[PDB]
Design a binder for this molecule. Sequence first.
Ligand SMILES: *[C@@H]1O[C@H](CO)[C@@H](O)[C@H](O)[C@H]1NC(C)=O
Ligand SMILES: *[C@@H]1O[C@H](CO)[C@@H](O)[C@H](O)[C@H]1NC(C)=O
Ligand SMILES: *[C@@H]1O[C@H](CO)[C@@H](O)[C@H](O)[C@H]1NC(C)=O
Ligand SMILES: *[C@@H]1O[C@H](CO)[C@@H](O)[C@H](O)[C@H]1NC(C)=O
Ligand SMILES: *[C@@H]1O[C@H](CO)[C@@H](O)[C@H](O)[C@H]1NC(C)=O
Ligand SMILES: *[C@@H]1O[C@H](CO)[C@@H](O)[C@H](O)[C@H]1NC(C)=O
Ligand SMILES: *[C@@H]1O[C@H](CO)[C@@H](O)[C@H](O)[C@H]1NC(C)=O
Ligand SMILES: *[C@@H]1O[C@H](CO)[C@@H](O)[C@H](O)[C@H]1NC(C)=O
Ligand SMILES: *[C@@H]1O[C@H](CO)[C@@H](O)[C@H](O)[C@H]1NC(C)=O
Ligand SMILES: *[C@@H]1O[C@H](CO)[C@@H](O)[C@H](O)[C@H]1NC(C)=O
Ligand SMILES: *[C@@H]1O[C@H](CO)[C@@H](O)[C@H](O)[C@H]1NC(C)=O
Ligand SMILES: *[C@@H]1O[C@H](CO)[C@@H](O)[C@H](O)[C@H]1NC(C)=O
Lengths: 135, 135, 135
Amino acid sequence: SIDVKYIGVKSAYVSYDVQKRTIYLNITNTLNITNNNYYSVEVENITAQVQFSKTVIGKARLNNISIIGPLDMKQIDYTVPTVIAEEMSYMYDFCTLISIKVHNIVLMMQVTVTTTYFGHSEQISQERYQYVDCG
Amino acid sequence: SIDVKYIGVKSAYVSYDVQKRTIYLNITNTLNITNNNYYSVEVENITAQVQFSKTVIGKARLNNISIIGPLDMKQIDYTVPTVIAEEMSYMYDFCTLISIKVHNIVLMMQVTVTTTYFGHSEQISQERYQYVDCG
Amino acid sequence: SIDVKYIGVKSAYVSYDVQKRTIYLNITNTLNITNNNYYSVEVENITAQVQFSKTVIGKARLNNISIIGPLDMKQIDYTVPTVIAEEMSYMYDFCTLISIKVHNIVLMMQVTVTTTYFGHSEQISQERYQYVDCG
Ligand SMILES: *[C@@H]1O[C@H](CO)[C@@H](O)[C@H](O)[C@H]1NC(C)=O
Ligand SMILES: *[C@@H]1O[C@H](CO)[C@@H](O)[C@H](O)[C@H]1NC(C)=O
Ligand SMILES: *[C@@H]1O[C@H](CO)[C@@H](O)[C@H](O)[C@H]1NC(C)=O
Ligand SMILES: *[C@@H]1O[C@H](CO)[C@@H](O)[C@H](O)[C@H]1NC(C)=O
Ligand SMILES: *[C@@H]1O[C@H](CO)[C@@H](O)[C@H](O)[C@H]1NC(C)=O
Ligand SMILES: *[C@@H]1O[C@H](CO)[C@@H](O)[C@H](O)[C@H]1NC(C)=O
Ligand SMILES: *[C@@H]1O[C@H](CO)[C@@H](O)[C@H](O)[C@H]1NC(C)=O
Ligand SMILES: *[C@@H]1O[C@H](CO)[C@@H](O)[C@H](O)[C@H]1NC(C)=O
Ligand SMILES: *[C@@H]1O[C@H](CO)[C@@H](O)[C@H](O)[C@H]1NC(C)=O
Ligand SMILES: *[C@@H]1O[C@H](CO)[C@@H](O)[C@H](O)[C@H]1NC(C)=O
Ligand SMILES: *[C@@H]1O[C@H](CO)[C@@H](O)[C@H](O)[C@H]1NC(C)=O
Ligand SMILES: *[C@@H]1O[C@H](CO)[C@@H](O)[C@H](O)[C@H]1NC(C)=O
């Protein structure tokens, strides 16, 4: 993961952020640039060789080699009564982003209950922009 | 994952963000650029060799080699009564993005209960823009 | 993870942030640049060789070699009654981002209950921008 970037307003290799009142003139700004990037990553050469009970040559009664489980998860239990029992909102809004009593959930799961798993996984997750940009 | 980017308003390799009042003139701005990018990633050369109980040559009674389970997940249980028992909203809005009592859920799952899985998975997830841009 | 960056407003290799009132002129600004980057990372050459009970040659009764479990997680239990029992909100807002009684949850899980797992995982997670930019 080479560039996990979080630039705030903006990114740029070569920028001229000139943004208030600036009489500027007769500039030469010669720019030779050689920005080579090389990426030679994640060269897996693996030989797992994953094996159960290779050679029971004779008479070996085997039993219960791999008991995974039993198991529960019960991950998300809000259990939120919220018995206000007198609501008088009287809610005057102006140009406000306003989230009320919302349940934003992003449950991303992968590679669950898999005996074996080679190679690789990847879970990216962007989040909301939500730009009012009011007057 | 080379560029997991989150640029805020904008990205640009070579930009001129000139955005207030700026008399500018007679500029040469020569730009030689060699931006080569090379990506040589994720070269898997794997030999899993995944095997159960290769050679029971003789008389081996085998039993219960791999008991996965039993199991439950029960992931999302809101259980949200919300018995207000007197609602007088009286809700005057102006140019407001307003989420009320919404349940945004994005449940992304993959590769579940798979004995074996080679290669790779990938779960991207963008989120909402929601740009009012009011007056 | 080479650049886990968190730039605040902005990033740039070669910038000219000129943003208040500045008479500037006759500048030469010659820039020879050789910004080569090389990335030769994560070259796995592994030979796991992961194996149970290779050779029971004779008569060995085996039993319960690997009992994982039983187990629970029960991760998220809000259990939030919030019985206000007299709500008089009277909530006048001006151009305010306002989150009220919201439950932002991002549950990212991966590679769960997997006997073996080669290669690599990756969980990025961006978060919300939420730029009002009011008057
Ligand atoms: C910009 O260049 C011209 C031509 O060489 C020169 O006459 C002028 O004086 C320069 N600008 C200023 C503000 O002097
Ligand atoms: C520009 O940069 C390249 C790469 O280093 C170089 O080969 C070339 O000679 C340079 N040219 C000038 C005019 O500086
Ligand atoms: C991968 O491993 C095998 C086994 O030793 C070897 O013969 C081969 O040259 C390796 N290749 C690379 C690119 O590492
Ligand atoms: C194997 O595991 C199961 C799972 O509970 C159990 O019921 C059984 O008795 C075990 N076998 C032996 C021989 O103990
Ligand atoms: C821009 O260039 C012209 C021609 O060389 C020059 O006469 C002028 O003075 C320059 N600009 C300014 C503001 O001086
Ligand atoms: C521009 O850059 C390339 C790459 O380095 C180089 O071969 C070429 O000579 C350069 N030309 C000039 C005019 O700088
Ligand atoms: C892949 O592995 C095999 C086994 O050793 C080897 O013969 C071959 O050269 C390897 N190839 C690469 C590109 O690594
Ligand atoms: C194998 O596992 C099952 C799962 O509960 C169990 O009922 C059974 O008794 C097990 N076998 C032995 C021989 O214990
Ligand atoms: C900028 O360059 C011109 C031409 O050489 C020169 O006459 C002028 O005086 C310079 N600017 C200022 C403010 O002197
Ligand atoms: C620019 O930099 C490159 C790389 O070091 C070099 O080969 C070239 O000669 C340089 N050119 C000048 C004009 O400085
Ligand atoms: C990987 O390991 C094998 C086993 O010793 C060896 O033959 C091979 O040269 C190695 N390759 C690399 C690129 O390390
Ligand atoms: C093997 O483990 C299971 C799991 O509880 C148990 O019931 C069983 O009695 C164990 N076997 C022996 C021989 O103890």
